[PDB]
């Protein structure tokens, strides 16, 4: 007769192809790509006949056989794809195959395959929406957030966004390529924690806990094998496979590896550090480059060259060529977008009209144009146009546009940057005529998280009453509150602003708006962005 | 300053003293009792000065110590206690130490120590009891009970329990040591697979898939080292500390090793097999002997000789005698009781006011004097007493009870015992006056789980309706129904009978009342057991 119904040990069922080491701070040990996972498995036939040749079937396809000798055996075996899997074990002999009850088994893969879906409900005041306007619609996400300010991958709005740029991977290297770090305390020695062993001008991940080691919501099982913004943005992928998840390389502090890629032998490196990063994390669509910015006047006034622009667009041709080998190995699309300054004194050092061959969007950083940095020179820290009472205004988001669009930088390449933040100064004095913004500051406004900057979240809920007064310039299509007793002045974006940046993209044939950085916003800033490009209410 | 603090990496949490290979089938390779468990604990320090010691405390006490030499570590020790501790890693340099937050680790014993009580509802009409009377409430558990009958030890209404015993344990050996397992389908078979290896005359465990392995409420985890019947039996000890769990070494088809005892070199084996046990299976409170019967009369035709009443004595002795010292190196006390024939026939064969002496207690089976085992002399299969129509009748639990007194044997030791099944006989005719019982059967009753036997709850569910007519006999002090049309007839005991046995026992003074088996019971058998003895309504 046909072998007794074998019962399958009780044992460990998730294995990964790519794994994370558990006790290794350094980037190098912690990740190990695989070829296949190695499953193993054990049975025991309580009652019957072992039958003569054991299987173990994967979807009732067989992973392994061998002879049945006894009452108990294991099997190991390697899976080369990342899933879940009904896994059985069968006896077979001359009379029939007796199949075992199915057991499910986990194959972890950076691809996120092996886990259910992160579809939260959004908060808020987040309203639904559909990406049909087919403009971009982006938002930063920082690596960061998940402590203080406590902004996990949970409590993005996903739906109401087209591209995620997670901010910021950083590019190894010690004292003289990454001395802007060290005015972070702690910072550059994470770096060095991080990439020990690793060469310079190669790719790495600034805090390996939150970004792969942090329980939270979905991957809180000490088994997962990848759990921080990682793990939560695979699965957020497995919830809106639509949504392009791009790693940002760069940002204000970690900008400075970039002036050395006049060197090839530096670039290539770095290049084939990110194809690696890629083949790697397979959950991001491509890369972002946030150079900030050819030419100098970051936050190393000791760098900064003529040669810059040419590295810049040298940068992005060999990117591109790399991420068009990726595309047709995998199958997938990669984009290559840069986050770019929209100052027209640093977009005239570089050739972007060249440049935009290379890439997918440029990520115009049409914010921050005044702040606590200047307590002289107050203004509309992101107003699409210059105010009344001075028209000459060089910042402008309008300036910005213009200075690309006058390089043969195609329109449409072209996604407009909202602030999800205000920039704000105390002490205002001086001012004329009623305009806070004529007069000078003493200091920078208390912000939320440091000193200069508040999250609208925090301006939308607390000074828009009270003393604060509210003016919505019309010239330059900005909002400001004033408090009058202290002099405490803040500019932002608001609903309306971001109407007029949406109706601006359209009416120019723009390519979307991107902001900075959704923890901020408490859906007012999101919710705008979508219905000013003409997104569908859901 | 003081190193910063190190985060406890991700790893497995439950280790084990005694530990089971989940992929072994034989008693002897199924369990391994080490002296402590292999504990390990890893840490990474994401920030900070490593310190120059590490430390792994328990509840806040060193376990291991050692050289911070790196940003990772790994320790390694043993536990020896069960229980679960608040574990934590600490970093040490002359400015101080800094201590990681607790992770909780468990480390299984078979004391239950790392279990969570099973603290479960009553069911069916189970009513609570307090076990204020002193006197004992006993009844089986039986190992198979787990599948068809689907009752589980979740399903226990334990605190109306002062004793548990589990039925059944088996003593290895082959051809011609447990033929009579040979009569049950794959029995024998089950017991040579589980005895692989292992010397006849040991104990050992039937059925190490329900025993062991099946997960059962509060053991579901892959990882819970004891699941099945033995690991909710740690659990149900956690919730009822009082409650004596007795494994039955024996029964009908498994006595037959008994017989062969008479050679000291076979006995002095089987004990030191039970202390061993014991000593493994740390939840179990002494041992149950169910030696069905010495002088033969058991299932098997061919064992069964004159010396078995010395041999049985002796084997009660020598059991006193190991569990006399195991108490004492433990601190705990362990019982030695017994199930016995309550027909003065086998009674008559030993020497129990010699035995009484070794023994806590001495289960009487006052059941199964009566069945379809015969068919031509009908009776009450329990009753206290004899009927009025054949006040002669030999198999009563008063002539049971008597026999016992008439050799000496204090009648504190005496439990007496009542049933949780009826026996029946089917087309009953020749009966004269109306009483069933003075006809003669042609055929057993369709039963419950197999012909003639009825599972009480059954009985009370569908038998007490319909043409089944319902007399209780005052005179023997039982219950029976009857179909006359099908001539269907049924002996069990009721609440009545049990009260009346139950003053009897306070009347006569005896030990208390057991029950065979409680899977069958829907609270009534019980809670009369309860009431009867005068335990308190909870």
Redesign the interface.
């Given at each position: 007769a046909a072998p007794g119904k074998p019962?399958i040990?009780?044992?460990?069922?998730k294995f990964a192809i790519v794994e994370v080491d558990?006790?290794?701070?350094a980037y190098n040990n912690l990740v190990k790509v695989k070829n296949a996972a190695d499953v193993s498995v054990?049975?025991?036939?309580?009652?019957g006949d072992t039958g003569t040749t054991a299987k173990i079937l994967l979807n009732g396809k067989e992973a392994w056989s061998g002879p049945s000798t006894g009452?108990?055996?294991?099997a190991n075996f390697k899976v080369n794809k990342g899933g879940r899997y009904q896994m059985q074990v069968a006896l077979c002999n001359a009379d029939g195959c007796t199949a075992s009850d199915a057991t499910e088994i986990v194959v972890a893969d950076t691809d996120g395959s092996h886990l259910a879906p992160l579809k939260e409900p959004l908060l808020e005041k987040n309203k639904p929406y559909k990406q049909n306007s087919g403009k971009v619609v982006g938002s930063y996400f920082v690596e960061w957030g998940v402590y203080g300010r406590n902004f996990t991958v949970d409590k993005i709005p996903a739906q109401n966004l087209t591209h995620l740029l997670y901010g910021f991977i950083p590019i190894c290297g010690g004292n003289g390529i990454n001395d802007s770090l060290k005015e972070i305390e702690?910072s550059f020695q994470?770096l060095q924690?991080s990439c020990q062993g690793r060469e310079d001008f190669k790719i790495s991940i600034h805090?390996?806990?939150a970004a792969l080691?942090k329980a939270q919501k979905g991957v809180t099982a000490?088994?997962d094998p990848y759990?921080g913004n990682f793990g939560q943005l695979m699965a957020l992928k497995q919830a809106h496979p639509d949504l392009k998840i791009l790693p940002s390389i760069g940002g204000w502090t970690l900008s400075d590896p970039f002036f050395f890629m006049g060197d090839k032998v530096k670039r290539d490196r770095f290049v084939g550090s990110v194809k690696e990063f890629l083949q790697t994390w397979k959950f991001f669509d491509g890369v972002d480059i946030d150079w900030e910015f050819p030419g100098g006047k970051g936050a190393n006034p000791n760098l900064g060259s003529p040669q810059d622009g040419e590295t810049y667009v040298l940068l992005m041709k060999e990117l591109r060529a790399m991420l068009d080998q990726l595309s047709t190995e995998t199958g997938r699309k990669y984009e290559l977008t840069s986050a770019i300054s929209a100052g027209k004194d640093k977009i005239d050092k570089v050739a972007y009209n060249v440049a935009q061959n290379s890439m997918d969007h440029i990520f115009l950083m049409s914010y921050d144009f005044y702040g606590a940095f200047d307590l002289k020179n107050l203004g509309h820290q992101t107003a699409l146009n210059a105010p009344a009472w001075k028209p000459d205004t060089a910042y402008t988001t309008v300036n910005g546009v213009n200075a690309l669009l006058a390089q043969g930088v195609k329109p449409g390449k072209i996604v407009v940057g909202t602030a999800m933040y205000g920039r704000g100064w105390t002490g205002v004095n001086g001012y004329q005529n009623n305009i806070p913004f004529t007069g000078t500051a003493t200091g920078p406004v208390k912000g939320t998280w440091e000193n200069g900057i508040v999250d609208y979240r925090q301006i939308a809920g607390q000074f828009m009453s009270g003393e604060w007064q509210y003016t919505y310039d019309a010239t330059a299509e900005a909002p400001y509150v004033f408090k009058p007793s202290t002099g405490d002045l803040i500019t932002f974006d608001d609903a309306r602003s971001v109407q007029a940046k949406g109706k601006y993209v359209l009416d120019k044939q723009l390519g979307g708006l991107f902001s900075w950085e959704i923890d901020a916003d408490n859906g007012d800033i999101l919710n705008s962005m979508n219905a000013s490009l003409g997104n569908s209410a859901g």
């Open positions: 019962t040990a009780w044992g460990n069922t558990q006790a290794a701070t054990s049975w025991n036939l309580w009652n009452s108990s055996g294991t702690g994470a924690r805090d390996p806990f080691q000490w088994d759990k």
